[PDB]
Design a protein around this ligand. Structure first.
Ligand SMILES: Nc1nc2c(ncn2[C@@H]2O[C@H](COP(=O)(O)O)[C@@H](O)[C@H]2O)c(=O)[nH]1
Ligand SMILES: Nc1nc2c(ncn2[C@@H]2O[C@H](COP(=O)(O)O)[C@@H](O)[C@H]2O)c(=O)[nH]1
Lengths: 173, 176
């Protein structure tokens, strides 16, 4: 897939960041190359349409690298984007979950029964995405799927999200 | 302007957040309404094309709510987006700049831009101008040329515009 290649070739890997032995996958070059960013959004949108058809009501973007992809992905799908933030940031009534960071969402972000796909840049342990799913569940939203550009498969984040489906463009050990 | 109205109607105000006496302007509903979001990006893009023609090399988006607009704006203009992040998040060699929020620090990769490259900075809202000023400083230290800073909202009583001068500033909407 030449589109996927446009994305993969713009992932930059930094050894020993932030700790010795870890390899950080830097997605910033994807954003800097407009053809790469377009390919990433296109591939995610095509997957989501092919999997869910018209069932998705909103994209939920995770603070803050999910914010980079969520709105463009939503726009490509003709959908709005709701925001899940680090705690203390959102005004008005909210719910929060601590996973030690805390996520937050406005109580009126979604109505009961609305269906959402959650997007972040990368899935590692799955802690962040798992917390997002729980928050959304407490609004009585249905999480159809979580998606990311990158998945670190040796950390088994996918298993953590089960039974909510997960999809990534690229996988690294 | 029907387009501008689509954006203004989707700004929500929260008095006494985060402190008593102020009014937080919430842009979240703009993102939730795809017509509103499209209008905001379109208005910003049209302004930038009308003001700079083809001279913009990159959009620089500010962590974290600038990230919501930066890539879509960049895409609309056919440009890439570079990131200015809260300190501690970026790999590789970086520069950072403090400003009062106590203090916060923004950071950029030393290799984000080459000397002479021309950039427009975007954030959701301009208040005191501290955040945008820090971004401008970082970019200047890379020897990039900051053509303009833009936002959806400007709180004019806080005089952030003057703080950025002589770098031009543009907002879609203004409140006291
Ligand atoms: N871009 C990038 N983000 C990472 C990396 N490791 C962790 N993250 C960030 O941390 C979260 C995923 O970590 P998790 O909660 O799944 O362990 C995501 O929000 C992601 O932005 C990495 O190697 N690259
Ligand atoms: N959406 C929103 N952001 C604000 C508000 N006040 C401060 N900010 C955030 O803080 C920064 C602007 O504050 P400044 O540094 O100009 O005083 C921006 O990054 C913006 O995201 C507000 O009322 N609404």
């Amino acid at each position: 897939d030449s589109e996927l290649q446009l994305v993969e070739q713009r992932i930059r890997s930094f050894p020993d960041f932030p700790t010795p032995g870890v390899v950080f996958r830097d997605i910033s070059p994807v954003l800097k190359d407009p053809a790469s960013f377009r390919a990433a959004i296109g591939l995610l949108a095509r997957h989501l349409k092919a999997t869910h058809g018209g069932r998705i009501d909103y994209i939920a973007g995770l603070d803050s690298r999910g914010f980079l992809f969520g709105p463009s992905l939503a726009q490509e799908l003709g959908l709005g984007c709701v925001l899940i933030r680090k705690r203390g940031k959102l005004p008005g009534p909210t719910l929060w979950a601590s996973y030690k960071a805390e996520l937050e969402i406005q109580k009126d972000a979604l109505e009961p029964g609305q269906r959402v796909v959650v997007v972040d840049d990368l899935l590692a342990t799955g802690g962040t995405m798992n917390a997002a799913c729980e928050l959304l569940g407490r609004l009585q939203a249905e999480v159809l799927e979580c998606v990311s550009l990158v998945e670190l498969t040796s950390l088994k984040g996918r298993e953590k999200l089960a039974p909510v489906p997960f999809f990534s463009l690229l996988q690294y050990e």
